[PDB]
Amino acid sequence: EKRVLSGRVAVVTGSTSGIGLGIAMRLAMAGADVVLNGRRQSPEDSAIVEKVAAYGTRVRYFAANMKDRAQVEALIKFTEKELGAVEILVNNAGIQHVSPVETFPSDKWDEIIALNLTSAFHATQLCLPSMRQRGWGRIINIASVQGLVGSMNKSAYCAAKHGLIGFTKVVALETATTGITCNAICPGYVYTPLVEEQIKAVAEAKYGGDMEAATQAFLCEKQPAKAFVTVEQVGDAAVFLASPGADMIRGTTITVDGGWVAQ
Amino acid sequence: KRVLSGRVAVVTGSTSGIGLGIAMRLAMAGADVVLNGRRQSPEDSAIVEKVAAYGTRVRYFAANMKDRAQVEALIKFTEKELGAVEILVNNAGIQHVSPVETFPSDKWDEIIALNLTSAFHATQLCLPSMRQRGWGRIINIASVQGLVGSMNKSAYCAAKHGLIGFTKVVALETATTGITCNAICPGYVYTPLVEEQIKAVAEAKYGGDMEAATQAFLCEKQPAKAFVTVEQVGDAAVFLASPGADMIRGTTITVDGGWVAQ
Amino acid sequence: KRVLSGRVAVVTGSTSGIGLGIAMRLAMAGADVVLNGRRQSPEDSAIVEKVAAYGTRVRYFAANMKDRAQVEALIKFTEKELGAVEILVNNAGIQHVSPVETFPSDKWDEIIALNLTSAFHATQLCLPSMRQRGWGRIINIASVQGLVGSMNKSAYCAAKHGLIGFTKVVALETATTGITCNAICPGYVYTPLVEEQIKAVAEAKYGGDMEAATQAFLCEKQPAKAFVTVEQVGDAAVFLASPGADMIRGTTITVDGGWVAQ
Amino acid sequence: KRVLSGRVAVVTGSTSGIGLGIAMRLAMAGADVVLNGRRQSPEDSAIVEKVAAYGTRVRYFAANMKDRAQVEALIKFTEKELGAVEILVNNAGIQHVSPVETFPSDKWDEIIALNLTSAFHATQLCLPSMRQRGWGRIINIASVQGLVGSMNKSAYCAAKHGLIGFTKVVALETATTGITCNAICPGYVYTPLVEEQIKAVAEAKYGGDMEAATQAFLCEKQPAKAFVTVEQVGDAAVFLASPGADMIRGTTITVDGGWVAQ
């Protein structure tokens, strides 16, 4: 019980890649046991368990599609069996689809709402009773600057992320007199596959295949620091929210965005 | 000579409450109006007559906004009867009060479907004509609950926050055009949606006393200690639809007696 | 007849720009108007005639809003000439562009004094009469720079943020009365305050090319790629002063071409 | 080996309350610390000893932050005793509760001077060294009152709103450097600044009952029904000063028991 989160059991959805893996790493570094998650029996990154287990805590991986409420429940029940009560829930799994509103596919709209907002509701609902019984909990929702402002061609995603922030506030208010907090982190751009795919698409469509020009234009359109936020930095924000100094941080956004929301 | 003369408006869920008040004010300002609700015969049998009193063309079309095909049928009906949809007011909406832990899955899905996704469907279906004609207004009826949270309203706060985010994106995609998209955020307004909540509170806490329950409900959130009216929400819709609001884009007009100010 | 018929309005700094545009729209809506600037002889010698074209009573009073005693003289003049101040528009404001490191101390103080503290002085002096009469409108001309920051505008963003916080408190202190207080937050409007900035940018970056400098200046911040007009800011003031805004309290009306939405 | 080892911090108004809590947390995290208040002999004779318990270099310098020449003296004292100022915490602040109508002109000016303008003076004096060194933290202690309004706190809400606006500008002017600027927004914390307000309420409304007044004061605004602690604010400052916060720029860290969430 030396490190700040020693003994706490965390679940990070969509932690085979990107921000989720970064968060899982930082939580383990801080002493938490961690359950990793994605859709596949074999993640594309075969080393994720080894990477997170390097910090001396207990780690598991469980394949579950967060768009299926029964699989969300399976992920929580597996954690309870393997490691113990879920004490830190990080709702992170998420997808993007870029399109003008007029031609935004109906199925893509529904999919983004299902994963990026409703899945967080399902998991939070499943975890809250145990947290209430134990008198402690953290629900950390990975929103976006796109939950606070709009961007062109991201209608479904901005809607889901705004919704996720509204959901965050309600959960925090319903738990405000308890040792359970609920907060959201709002990253600006982070160089993960979700962003790389977008930059590749505009590089081909607009910049003659020049990935450096496309990266600079994509980043600097929105982010005054003219640099990406890192997955380690988002993880550090998750560790902060999970720590005792954040016992009275409730229903808020921690924006880690290079200045995007400031202007 | 009226400020919206000749404009064709569609107001979803306009058989009752705020939607009907908006329709009334739009017609007072000279717009033709298509009213809408789920029923072949709305409960209020005089809604067409009440809105038609201001000398504009009025229609009613029954369509459930949770069904994309019926949203499309509403838009096509308007195009056929009155002409292109120029003012779209996404207003139909529902509430369900429950703690998060026991919030029914189907009730969450229903609230997201109507209070957020149906606005996406109707906006998607109306924007092409608006772009072709170079003018439009999309007015989304959000809530103070789209800006802050309240206990036992997780789905509704989520949907209304999401509706405001959607508003911003549509406004930005149209920012260099004659189309604007904005949201109105009312505080509490005394409609059946709120009356049913006050009844539940009166029965649980105040021995059925609606006078007492209404004041307790209102004063928990609304520093003016008075309700916002359907006419006031309609006046905000007229303002957003008028030429003075050509450069109001992607914003919230909050009409809430001070709720968000504190 | 007209919505503000007979109401007595004071618009500070209404010899130019947004203030004159607000005064014009308030007069068009039927209000009597007191115009105000620093000079006995405003640069624009025609302001009283331009505002008086709408058939209401118009006056001019020279007073520097940075001096509480001259604020009081303006209110007293209005009370003697036209009657009690019913609509107060706190609009006079200045700008100074500089990095924080070299921002002159006296310029910081001057911006705080005019763009924030003068609104407190005028509001304090007008509220007793509004309370005695059971009605009032205080309309504070803020900025998008009261909601977000921009480089090289530390004092102005501070003052305008402060003005928005002040607006909320005044609104909460009057929430159960017939007095409201709100702010309007324009984006860029083509006034001398902005033209001077565009001139500086042109010389620093665009070799004196006003057109190039004007498109760069706008499109850095304002997605509509067009200026907001003084008439549009005036129409927002009329809306806030009307009966449909009786329950709009402590809020911002953002008229900005999409700036705050992204 | 601790996360802020070797960094030199200055915390203004750190003889009491939140400022002392921040100083303690920064030192626990490895920072050298300069404490500050108005008095040659602070009321708490032990502040230096308490902060120095964590094995870092600690100093105290008496200076009134409303006087730009004394802000400069504090910075120059720090440079001489400990080295370049790397972490600046603008914390010193005062409160005055009064309705707007009777708010004393002098108390308004005093609150603006200390709660807003002093942060500008100290920031302006510290930035040049931070830019040369390529690293810095400016942490401004705002309030939930910088994000929303409360009755009878016009000057304070204005100043704290302005401080948040200033924070954004400084962060944008430094966004491509190793300097960040951010604000912490606490809800109610049980310091003398709050205890004096509760005593006023108790004597005015609860017949001297401090326990009743405390619960009413707290529960009107703060859904957690508990006070935030000076240690928690300090932990937020340590987080902002840490490497994980290198890309947190121009934002608010709100530590308020849910106040802004509703």
Ligand SMILES: NC(=O)C1=CN([C@@H]2O[C@H](COP(=O)(O)OP(=O)(O)OC[C@H]3O[C@@H](n4cnc5c(N)ncnc54)[C@H](OP(=O)(O)O)[C@@H]3O)[C@@H](O)[C@H]2O)C=CC1
């Ligand atoms: N990158 C950025 O700039 C920003 C990202 N965010 C948010 O960060 C979060 C992570 O995104 P990021 O790391 O960027 O994107 P990545 O695509 O790198 O990671 C996405 C993660 O989600 C998992 N995943 C996808 N669909 C499902 C599903 N249906 N069920 C379970 N797991 C799933 C993937 O795992 P697998 O493929 O193994 O199933 C992967 O682990 C998202 O919520 C995103 O909105 C917020 C702000 C900025």
Ligand SMILES: NC(=O)C1=CN([C@@H]2O[C@H](COP(=O)(O)OP(=O)(O)OC[C@H]3O[C@@H](n4cnc5c(N)ncnc54)[C@H](OP(=O)(O)O)[C@@H]3O)[C@@H](O)[C@H]2O)C=CC1
């Ligand atoms: N009342 C308040 O305090 C506030 C309300 N709002 C918003 O105002 C909007 C109107 O609500 P309000 O007037 O209060 O509530 P009402 O219940 O009074 O009106 C709801 C309207 O929606 C219609 N409706 C319901 N479901 C559907 C559907 N699936 N398809 C089409 N029409 C439908 C009803 O018509 P029928 O029954 O005839 O089908 C009725 O006309 C909602 O979006 C609500 O969220 C926002 C802030 C405050």
Ligand SMILES: NC(=O)C1=CN([C@@H]2O[C@H](COP(=O)(O)OP(=O)(O)OC[C@H]3O[C@@H](n4cnc5c(N)ncnc54)[C@H](OP(=O)(O)O)[C@@H]3O)[C@@H](O)[C@H]2O)C=CC1
């Ligand atoms: N232009 C823009 O893009 C935006 C402007 N604003 C705000 O709009 C308001 C008006 O600015 P705008 O019209 O652009 O600026 P202008 O410079 O065009 O007008 C400024 C007005 O203030 C008057 N004035 C200046 N100092 C004083 C003083 N001490 N006492 C009394 N009157 C004074 C001037 O009158 P005289 O010289 O005759 O004394 C003039 O009428 C300001 O508060 C500004 O911050 C907000 C958002 C955008």
Ligand SMILES: NC(=O)C1=CN([C@@H]2O[C@H](COP(=O)(O)OP(=O)(O)OC[C@H]3O[C@@H](n4cnc5c(N)ncnc54)[C@H](OP(=O)(O)O)[C@@H]3O)[C@@H](O)[C@H]2O)C=CC1
């Ligand atoms: N307490 C709360 O609930 C909240 C407080 N805050 C903010 O926290 C900060 C500290 O507040 P809090 O700790 O509560 O108040 P305290 O009154 O407990 O402490 C105030 C500190 O400021 C010092 N001080 C006062 N005037 C000056 C001056 N002119 N120059 C230098 N130092 C001065 C005092 O030291 P000395 O008397 O020795 O000079 C004391 O150290 C303030 O900015 C306040 O607005 C924000 C949110 C909530």
